[PDB]
Amino acid sequence: QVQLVQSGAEVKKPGASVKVSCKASGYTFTSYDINWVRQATGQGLEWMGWMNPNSGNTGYAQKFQGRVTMTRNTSISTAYMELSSLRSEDTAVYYCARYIVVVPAAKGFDPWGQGTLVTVSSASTKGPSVFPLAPSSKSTSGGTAALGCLVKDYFPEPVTVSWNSGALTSGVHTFPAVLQSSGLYSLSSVVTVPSSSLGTQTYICNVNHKPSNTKVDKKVEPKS
Amino acid sequence: FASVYAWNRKRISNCVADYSVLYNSASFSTFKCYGVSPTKLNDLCFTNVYADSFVIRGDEVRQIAPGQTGKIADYNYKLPDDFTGCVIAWNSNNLDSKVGGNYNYLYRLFRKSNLKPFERDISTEIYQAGSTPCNGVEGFNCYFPLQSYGFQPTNGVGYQPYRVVVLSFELLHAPATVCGPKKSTNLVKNKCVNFNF
Amino acid sequence: DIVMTQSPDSLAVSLGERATINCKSSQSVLYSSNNKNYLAWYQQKPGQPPKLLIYWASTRESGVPDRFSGSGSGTDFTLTISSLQAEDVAVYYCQQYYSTPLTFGGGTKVEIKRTVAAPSVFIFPPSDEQLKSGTASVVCLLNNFYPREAKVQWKVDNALQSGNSQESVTEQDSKDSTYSLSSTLTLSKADYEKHKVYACEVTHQGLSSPVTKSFNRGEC
Ligand SMILES: *[C@@H]1O[C@H](CO)[C@@H](O[C@@H]2O[C@H](CO)[C@@H](O[C@@H]3O[C@H](CO)[C@@H](O)[C@H](O)[C@H]3NC(C)=O)[C@H](O)[C@H]2NC(C)=O)[C@H](O)[C@H]1NC(C)=O
């Protein structure tokens, strides 16, 4: 079927090289040009089209030149992309699309890759440090009061914090992680709960770090 | 067989055509007759019969019919809207599909304008999609116009190769031509009989 | 060369409305009689790959209901979704075609009906565990709120603090179309222990005058 499969959500150190894959299906493959795009955190896109079914001269975006290399295999129709000499600000997500055509002129991109992750930075990997942010009268207002968990200083971007093993879905809001100057991420997830219920029930944040194997449950209680 | 974008064209001529050996052969997966129902073929006479031959996918046999659309009927092989003949088709997976992919069976997938009926186009010019002259080189909006079925023996039906033959009976304005056979009988010497010689 | 400057941004308007997103540069009518256009419209759900909308600029939607509806001319055009409905909240880019690259930026959220509303504010002092480690995070939370154009001013002993905070904000909420914001102030243990009052002063359209939530370091 009309599909595009990417793989390789990974982490690199600056001054290195990476190869990224897009697997296709449900088509003749060598008949539609593969086009990749960059996308930062909440930004636009770029990277002009290039590469063709047969041989294909391949193009570029003229500020990415030399570092960019495009190789594929006629064994199944899987286009790739080799980037080199990474500078720890090219950390982004990278896509694939088939750029389908029809008699007159092709109309936009046919499909759309699932995207991938490349994170560049001399950090390697580190586990999160967790604190509970207690419910307080400065957070309390009338009928409700808010409490949460601060999970900070970790490199391996995908991290999750749940409330009570996934029980509370009301008021639970995890905020986007922030990238510090130290190079490590940090975030805080907070949930509001009736002020009559400050310590009454269970509010334990379950912190799981999937690139590592960290799993810790922290209880949040009103301030002493 | 012959490609789908350059079909063949045999002009059957004066002879004795027996469409019964065709009609009852039970080896054909598709035998549709349009101008004339099949059983009455061995009882009529025309001026010329043409036979066109090619190879397509399994599920593109429904575009070989009068009044269809699609990449095959648009610009590979177009049947007029008052067709007269019959269309025959049978699966040929074991002959035409080979492990690793048989990349010798191409089809045209871009053309300026749909074909006139029974028109044929074997050119290989770079399809200029964009206003930018292609100059004869590939690139964005400058595409090679021919694609190839990569047939492989482990393909689901509807992606295996089917061979197609389109018989088209035409009647110009000559004096006669090919017709069906005609049986006879014996001689009943000495018996008032009703005869036709 | 061809820059696709899109004017409007964050059209957080009540569902059903009729947004009008304009952009243009350096016409691409494309000769060859094919007088159509040259640029598609896109829709990218947050946390998702993009999708395809109106192309050729010519309303040519594919598996897409009619409310999403394009237009076109030689240089200027617009997407103009009608009778907008929940789950059309996305980011809407443009194209260029024969050009080379792309360019576009747009999106929406909500608006509501009641007053401009206001955030619940809450300040959290650093946990005793962290002060062992030798650093103090001071979190201030702003809960539910439409106008995201909120200001978070940290003050330490009444000194406005500049350059040691970070904020992040949530996606517009699919239920009540509000936004929530978390600002973190980061200090050393040593510098933390040098001051007393930590305050977080929030300014917002639903507040007649700013709200300050504050604590006093070392007071149970
Ligand atoms: C891109 O296409 C290539 C073919 O053009 C694929 O290549 C072959 O991959 C085989 C693994 O599936 C390798 O296999 C064996 O390798 C061992 C160790 O090197 C040898 O001892 C064996 O003799 C060898 N056996 C055979 C019969 O291959 C092949 O060495 C390798 N050869 C070729 C033709 O390159 C690639 O795998 C394919 N890559 C992708 C991503 O599609």
Short mmCIF file of N, CA and C in Angstrom, two decimals, chain C residues 12-143:
data_model
loop_
_atom_site.label_atom_id
_atom_site.label_comp_id
_atom_site.label_asym_id
_atom_site.label_seq_id
_atom_site.Cartn_x
_atom_site.Cartn_y
_atom_site.Cartn_z
N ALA C 12 -6.99 31.62 16.74
CA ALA C 12 -7.84 31.01 17.76
C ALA C 12 -9.22 31.66 17.79
N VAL C 13 -10.10 31.19 16.92
CA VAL C 13 -11.46 31.72 16.84
C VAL C 13 -12.49 30.62 17.04
N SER C 14 -13.67 31.00 17.52
CA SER C 14 -14.75 30.05 17.76
C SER C 14 -14.97 29.15 16.55
N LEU C 15 -15.15 27.86 16.81
CA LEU C 15 -15.37 26.89 15.74
C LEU C 15 -16.49 27.35 14.80
N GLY C 16 -16.41 26.91 13.55
CA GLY C 16 -17.41 27.27 12.56
C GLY C 16 -17.04 28.52 11.79
N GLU C 17 -16.18 29.34 12.39
CA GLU C 17 -15.74 30.58 11.76
C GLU C 17 -15.18 30.32 10.36
N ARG C 18 -14.76 31.39 9.69
CA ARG C 18 -14.20 31.28 8.35
C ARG C 18 -12.83 31.94 8.27
N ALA C 19 -11.79 31.20 8.63
CA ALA C 19 -10.43 31.71 8.60
C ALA C 19 -10.02 32.04 7.17
N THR C 20 -9.05 32.93 7.03
CA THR C 20 -8.61 33.43 5.72
C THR C 20 -7.10 33.65 5.77
N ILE C 21 -6.35 32.71 5.22
CA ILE C 21 -4.90 32.69 5.36
C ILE C 21 -4.26 33.08 4.04
N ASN C 22 -3.56 34.19 4.03
CA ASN C 22 -3.03 34.75 2.80
C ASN C 22 -1.52 34.62 2.78
N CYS C 23 -0.98 34.45 1.57
CA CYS C 23 0.46 34.44 1.34
C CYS C 23 0.77 34.66 -0.13
N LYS C 24 1.96 35.19 -0.42
CA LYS C 24 2.36 35.48 -1.80
C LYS C 24 3.85 35.74 -1.93
N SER C 25 4.42 35.40 -3.09
CA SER C 25 5.66 35.96 -3.64
C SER C 25 5.88 35.49 -5.06
N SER C 26 6.17 36.42 -5.99
CA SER C 26 6.92 36.13 -7.22
C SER C 26 6.31 35.05 -8.11
N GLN C 27 5.20 35.37 -8.77
CA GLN C 27 4.16 34.49 -9.32
C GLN C 27 4.67 33.23 -10.03
N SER C 28 3.89 32.16 -9.94
CA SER C 28 4.25 30.89 -10.56
C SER C 28 3.10 30.34 -11.41
N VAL C 29 2.42 31.23 -12.13
CA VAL C 29 1.31 30.83 -12.97
C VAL C 29 1.66 29.62 -13.83
N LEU C 30 2.92 29.53 -14.23
CA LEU C 30 3.39 28.42 -15.05
C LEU C 30 2.67 28.39 -16.40
N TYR C 31 3.39 28.77 -17.45
CA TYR C 31 2.82 28.79 -18.80
C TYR C 31 2.44 27.39 -19.25
N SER C 32 2.47 27.16 -20.56
CA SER C 32 2.12 25.86 -21.12
C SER C 32 0.62 25.65 -21.13
N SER C 33 -0.13 26.75 -21.22
CA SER C 33 -1.59 26.68 -21.24
C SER C 33 -2.13 26.14 -19.92
N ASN C 34 -1.31 25.37 -19.22
CA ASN C 34 -1.71 24.79 -17.94
C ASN C 34 -1.99 25.86 -16.89
N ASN C 35 -2.56 26.98 -17.32
CA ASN C 35 -2.88 28.07 -16.41
C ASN C 35 -3.68 27.61 -15.20
N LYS C 36 -2.99 27.06 -14.21
CA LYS C 36 -3.64 26.57 -13.00
C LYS C 36 -3.07 27.25 -11.76
N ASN C 37 -1.80 26.98 -11.47
CA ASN C 37 -1.14 27.56 -10.31
C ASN C 37 0.24 26.95 -10.06
N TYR C 38 0.45 26.46 -8.84
CA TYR C 38 1.72 25.85 -8.48
C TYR C 38 2.02 25.99 -6.99
N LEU C 39 1.29 25.23 -6.17
CA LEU C 39 1.46 25.25 -4.72
C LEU C 39 0.29 24.55 -4.04
N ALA C 40 0.59 23.73 -3.04
CA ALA C 40 -0.44 23.01 -2.33
C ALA C 40 -0.58 23.65 -0.97
N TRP C 41 -1.60 23.22 -0.25
CA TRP C 41 -1.88 23.67 1.11
C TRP C 41 -1.59 22.44 1.94
N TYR C 42 -1.17 22.61 3.19
CA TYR C 42 -0.85 21.43 3.98
C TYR C 42 -1.50 21.51 5.34
N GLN C 43 -1.65 20.36 5.97
CA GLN C 43 -2.15 20.29 7.33
C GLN C 43 -1.30 19.32 8.10
N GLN C 44 -0.72 19.79 9.19
CA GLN C 44 0.12 18.96 10.04
C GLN C 44 -0.45 19.00 11.45
N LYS C 45 -0.97 17.88 11.90
CA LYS C 45 -1.46 17.78 13.26
C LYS C 45 -0.26 17.80 14.21
N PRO C 46 -0.40 18.35 15.40
CA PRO C 46 0.73 18.39 16.33
C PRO C 46 1.11 17.00 16.80
N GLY C 47 2.41 16.73 16.75
CA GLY C 47 2.87 15.38 16.99
C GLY C 47 2.50 14.41 15.91
N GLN C 48 2.54 14.83 14.65
CA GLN C 48 2.11 14.00 13.54
C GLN C 48 2.85 14.44 12.29
N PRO C 49 2.96 13.58 11.29
CA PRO C 49 3.44 14.03 9.99
C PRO C 49 2.41 14.92 9.34
N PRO C 50 2.80 15.72 8.34
CA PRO C 50 1.82 16.53 7.62
C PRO C 50 0.87 15.70 6.78
N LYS C 51 -0.10 16.38 6.20
CA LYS C 51 -1.06 15.77 5.30
C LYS C 51 -1.25 16.70 4.12
N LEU C 52 -2.04 16.28 3.15
CA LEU C 52 -2.25 17.09 1.98
C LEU C 52 -3.68 17.63 1.96
N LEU C 53 -3.79 18.88 1.53
CA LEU C 53 -5.03 19.60 1.34
C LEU C 53 -5.04 20.12 -0.08
N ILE C 54 -5.81 21.19 -0.31
CA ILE C 54 -5.99 21.85 -1.61
C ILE C 54 -4.69 21.99 -2.37
N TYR C 55 -4.68 21.51 -3.61
CA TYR C 55 -3.53 21.64 -4.48
C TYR C 55 -3.97 22.14 -5.84
N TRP C 56 -2.95 22.48 -6.64
CA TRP C 56 -2.99 23.39 -7.79
C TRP C 56 -3.49 24.79 -7.47
N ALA C 57 -3.66 25.11 -6.18
CA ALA C 57 -4.57 26.12 -5.62
C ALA C 57 -6.02 25.91 -6.05
N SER C 58 -6.36 24.73 -6.55
CA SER C 58 -7.58 24.58 -7.33
C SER C 58 -8.59 23.68 -6.66
N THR C 59 -8.76 23.84 -5.35
CA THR C 59 -9.84 23.22 -4.56
C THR C 59 -9.80 21.69 -4.64
N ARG C 60 -8.64 21.12 -4.94
CA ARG C 60 -8.63 19.77 -5.49
C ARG C 60 -8.53 18.71 -4.41
N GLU C 61 -9.12 18.97 -3.24
CA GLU C 61 -9.10 18.16 -2.02
C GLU C 61 -9.27 16.66 -2.22
N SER C 62 -8.51 15.86 -1.46
CA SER C 62 -8.48 14.43 -1.70
C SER C 62 -8.80 13.63 -0.45
N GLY C 63 -10.01 13.07 -0.39
CA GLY C 63 -10.47 12.41 0.81
C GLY C 63 -10.69 13.43 1.91
N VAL C 64 -11.06 14.64 1.50
CA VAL C 64 -11.09 15.80 2.38
C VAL C 64 -12.45 16.48 2.23
N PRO C 65 -13.19 16.70 3.31
CA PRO C 65 -14.52 17.30 3.18
C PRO C 65 -14.46 18.76 2.80
N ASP C 66 -15.61 19.29 2.38
CA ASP C 66 -15.70 20.50 1.57
C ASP C 66 -15.34 21.78 2.31
N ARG C 67 -15.44 21.78 3.64
CA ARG C 67 -15.25 22.97 4.46
C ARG C 67 -13.86 23.56 4.27
N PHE C 68 -12.87 22.68 4.18
CA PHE C 68 -11.55 23.05 3.71
C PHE C 68 -11.64 23.33 2.22
N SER C 69 -11.33 24.56 1.82
CA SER C 69 -11.65 25.02 0.46
C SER C 69 -10.62 26.08 0.09
N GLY C 70 -9.98 25.89 -1.05
CA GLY C 70 -8.94 26.81 -1.47
C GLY C 70 -9.43 27.92 -2.37
N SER C 71 -8.47 28.68 -2.88
CA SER C 71 -8.68 29.64 -3.96
C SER C 71 -7.33 29.87 -4.62
N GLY C 72 -7.27 30.80 -5.56
CA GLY C 72 -6.04 31.01 -6.28
C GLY C 72 -6.11 32.20 -7.22
N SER C 73 -4.93 32.70 -7.54
CA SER C 73 -4.69 33.63 -8.64
C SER C 73 -3.24 33.48 -9.09
N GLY C 74 -2.74 34.47 -9.83
CA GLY C 74 -1.37 34.43 -10.29
C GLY C 74 -0.29 34.53 -9.23
N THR C 75 -0.40 35.48 -8.30
CA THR C 75 0.60 35.64 -7.24
C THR C 75 -0.01 35.39 -5.87
N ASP C 76 -1.22 35.89 -5.65
CA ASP C 76 -1.85 35.86 -4.35
C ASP C 76 -2.93 34.80 -4.34
N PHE C 77 -3.20 34.26 -3.15
CA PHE C 77 -4.25 33.27 -2.94
C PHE C 77 -4.54 33.11 -1.47
N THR C 78 -5.43 32.17 -1.18
CA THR C 78 -5.84 31.92 0.19
C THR C 78 -6.41 30.51 0.29
N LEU C 79 -6.07 29.83 1.38
CA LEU C 79 -6.95 28.82 1.92
C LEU C 79 -8.03 29.56 2.68
N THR C 80 -9.24 29.01 2.71
CA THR C 80 -10.35 29.63 3.41
C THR C 80 -11.34 28.59 3.91
N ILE C 81 -10.94 27.85 4.94
CA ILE C 81 -11.78 26.81 5.52
C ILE C 81 -13.10 27.40 6.03
N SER C 82 -14.20 26.72 5.71
CA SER C 82 -15.52 27.17 6.14
C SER C 82 -16.10 26.25 7.21
N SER C 83 -17.06 26.77 7.97
CA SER C 83 -17.69 26.00 9.04
C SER C 83 -16.67 25.15 9.78
N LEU C 84 -15.60 25.78 10.25
CA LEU C 84 -14.55 25.08 10.98
C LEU C 84 -15.13 24.26 12.12
N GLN C 85 -14.52 23.11 12.39
CA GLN C 85 -14.98 22.23 13.46
C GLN C 85 -13.80 21.68 14.26
N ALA C 86 -14.08 21.25 15.49
CA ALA C 86 -13.05 20.71 16.36
C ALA C 86 -12.16 19.72 15.61
N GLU C 87 -10.87 19.73 15.93
CA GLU C 87 -9.89 18.83 15.28
C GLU C 87 -9.37 19.36 13.94
N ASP C 88 -9.54 20.64 13.66
CA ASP C 88 -8.91 21.30 12.52
C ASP C 88 -7.76 22.16 13.00
N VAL C 89 -7.49 22.02 14.29
CA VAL C 89 -6.43 22.76 14.95
C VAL C 89 -5.10 22.19 14.52
N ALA C 90 -4.40 22.90 13.65
CA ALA C 90 -3.16 22.39 13.11
C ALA C 90 -2.29 23.56 12.68
N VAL C 91 -1.25 23.25 11.94
CA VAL C 91 -0.36 24.26 11.37
C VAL C 91 -0.42 24.09 9.86
N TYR C 92 -0.55 25.20 9.15
CA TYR C 92 -0.96 25.18 7.75
C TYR C 92 0.11 25.87 6.92
N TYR C 93 0.89 25.10 6.20
CA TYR C 93 1.99 25.63 5.42
C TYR C 93 1.58 25.80 3.97
N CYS C 94 2.46 26.42 3.19
CA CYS C 94 2.21 26.64 1.78
C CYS C 94 3.22 25.85 0.96
N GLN C 95 3.53 26.33 -0.24
CA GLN C 95 4.48 25.66 -1.12
C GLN C 95 5.16 26.65 -2.06
N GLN C 96 5.78 26.14 -3.11
CA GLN C 96 6.47 26.98 -4.08
C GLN C 96 6.48 26.35 -5.47
N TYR C 97 6.69 25.04 -5.52
CA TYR C 97 6.73 24.32 -6.79
C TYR C 97 8.08 24.47 -7.48
N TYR C 98 8.04 24.66 -8.79
CA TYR C 98 9.26 24.82 -9.58
C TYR C 98 10.32 25.67 -8.88
N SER C 99 9.89 26.45 -7.89
CA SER C 99 10.80 27.32 -7.15
C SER C 99 12.02 26.55 -6.68
N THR C 100 11.92 25.98 -5.48
CA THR C 100 13.00 25.20 -4.89
C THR C 100 12.59 24.72 -3.49
N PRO C 101 12.48 25.66 -2.55
CA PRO C 101 12.10 25.32 -1.17
C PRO C 101 10.64 25.64 -0.91
N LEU C 102 10.30 25.82 0.37
CA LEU C 102 8.93 26.13 0.75
C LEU C 102 8.89 27.29 1.73
N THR C 103 7.73 27.54 2.31
CA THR C 103 7.56 28.62 3.26
C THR C 103 6.10 28.81 3.63
N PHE C 104 5.83 28.86 4.93
CA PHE C 104 4.46 29.04 5.42
C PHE C 104 4.39 28.85 6.93
N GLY C 105 3.37 29.43 7.55
CA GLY C 105 3.20 29.32 8.98
C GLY C 105 1.85 29.85 9.43
N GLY C 106 1.07 28.99 10.07
CA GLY C 106 -0.25 29.37 10.55
C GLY C 106 -0.85 28.33 11.48
N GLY C 107 -1.90 28.72 12.19
CA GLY C 107 -2.56 27.82 13.12
C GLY C 107 -3.68 28.50 13.89
N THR C 108 -4.37 27.73 14.72
CA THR C 108 -5.47 28.26 15.52
C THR C 108 -5.63 27.48 16.82
N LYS C 109 -6.64 27.84 17.60
CA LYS C 109 -6.90 27.18 18.87
C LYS C 109 -8.37 27.30 19.26
N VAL C 110 -8.69 28.32 20.05
CA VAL C 110 -10.06 28.55 20.50
C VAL C 110 -10.30 30.02 20.83
N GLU C 111 -11.41 30.30 21.50
CA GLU C 111 -11.75 31.66 21.88
C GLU C 111 -12.71 31.68 23.06
N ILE C 112 -13.68 30.77 23.05
CA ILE C 112 -14.66 30.68 24.13
C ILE C 112 -15.71 31.78 24.01
N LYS C 113 -16.48 31.98 25.07
CA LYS C 113 -17.52 33.00 25.09
C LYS C 113 -17.42 33.87 26.33
N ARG C 114 -17.27 33.23 27.49
CA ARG C 114 -17.16 33.95 28.75
C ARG C 114 -16.05 34.99 28.70
N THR C 115 -15.86 35.71 29.81
CA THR C 115 -14.83 36.73 29.89
C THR C 115 -13.47 36.19 29.45
N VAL C 116 -12.49 37.08 29.34
CA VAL C 116 -11.15 36.69 28.92
C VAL C 116 -10.55 35.66 29.87
N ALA C 117 -11.34 35.25 30.86
CA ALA C 117 -10.89 34.27 31.84
C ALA C 117 -9.62 34.74 32.55
N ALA C 118 -8.97 33.82 33.26
CA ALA C 118 -7.75 34.13 33.97
C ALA C 118 -7.09 32.85 34.48
N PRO C 119 -5.78 32.87 34.66
CA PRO C 119 -5.10 31.66 35.12
C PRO C 119 -5.23 31.47 36.62
N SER C 120 -5.30 30.22 37.04
CA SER C 120 -4.95 29.89 38.41
C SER C 120 -3.43 29.94 38.50
N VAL C 121 -2.89 30.66 39.49
CA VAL C 121 -1.45 30.76 39.67
C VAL C 121 -1.04 29.97 40.90
N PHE C 122 0.16 29.40 40.86
CA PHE C 122 0.69 28.62 41.98
C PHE C 122 2.22 28.61 41.95
N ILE C 123 2.84 28.88 43.10
CA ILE C 123 4.30 28.90 43.18
C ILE C 123 4.74 27.75 44.06
N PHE C 124 5.79 27.05 43.63
CA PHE C 124 6.32 25.89 44.33
C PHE C 124 7.76 26.17 44.75
N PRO C 125 8.09 26.10 46.03
CA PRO C 125 9.48 26.26 46.45
C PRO C 125 10.29 25.02 46.12
N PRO C 126 11.62 25.09 46.17
CA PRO C 126 12.42 23.91 45.85
C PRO C 126 12.32 22.84 46.93
N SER C 127 12.30 21.58 46.49
CA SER C 127 12.22 20.48 47.43
C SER C 127 13.51 20.31 48.21
N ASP C 128 13.38 19.84 49.46
CA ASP C 128 14.55 19.68 50.31
C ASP C 128 15.57 18.73 49.70
N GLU C 129 15.12 17.78 48.88
CA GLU C 129 16.06 16.85 48.24
C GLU C 129 17.00 17.58 47.30
N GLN C 130 16.47 18.57 46.58
CA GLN C 130 17.27 19.28 45.59
C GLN C 130 18.29 20.19 46.24
N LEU C 131 17.94 20.81 47.37
CA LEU C 131 18.89 21.68 48.05
C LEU C 131 20.08 20.88 48.58
N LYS C 132 19.90 19.59 48.84
CA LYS C 132 21.06 18.75 49.12
C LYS C 132 21.99 18.72 47.92
N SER C 133 21.43 18.46 46.74
CA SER C 133 22.21 18.36 45.51
C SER C 133 23.00 19.63 45.22
N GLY C 134 22.51 20.78 45.65
CA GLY C 134 23.20 22.03 45.49
C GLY C 134 22.62 23.00 44.49
N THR C 135 21.35 22.85 44.13
CA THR C 135 20.67 23.71 43.17
C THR C 135 19.20 23.85 43.60
N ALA C 136 18.59 24.98 43.24
CA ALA C 136 17.21 25.29 43.62
C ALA C 136 16.38 25.63 42.38
N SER C 137 15.40 24.79 42.04
CA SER C 137 14.40 25.16 41.04
C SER C 137 13.17 25.71 41.74
N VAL C 138 12.68 26.85 41.26
CA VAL C 138 11.51 27.49 41.81
C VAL C 138 10.47 27.54 40.70
N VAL C 139 9.43 26.74 40.82
CA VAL C 139 8.47 26.60 39.73
C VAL C 139 7.28 27.49 40.03
N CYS C 140 6.73 28.08 38.98
CA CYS C 140 5.51 28.87 39.06
C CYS C 140 4.59 28.39 37.96
N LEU C 141 3.37 28.03 38.32
CA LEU C 141 2.43 27.44 37.38
C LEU C 141 1.27 28.40 37.10
N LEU C 142 0.85 28.49 35.83
CA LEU C 142 -0.32 29.26 35.41
C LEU C 142 -1.28 28.30 34.76
N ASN C 143 -2.43 28.07 35.38
CA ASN C 143 -3.30 26.98 34.98
C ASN C 143 -4.48 27.49 34.16
#
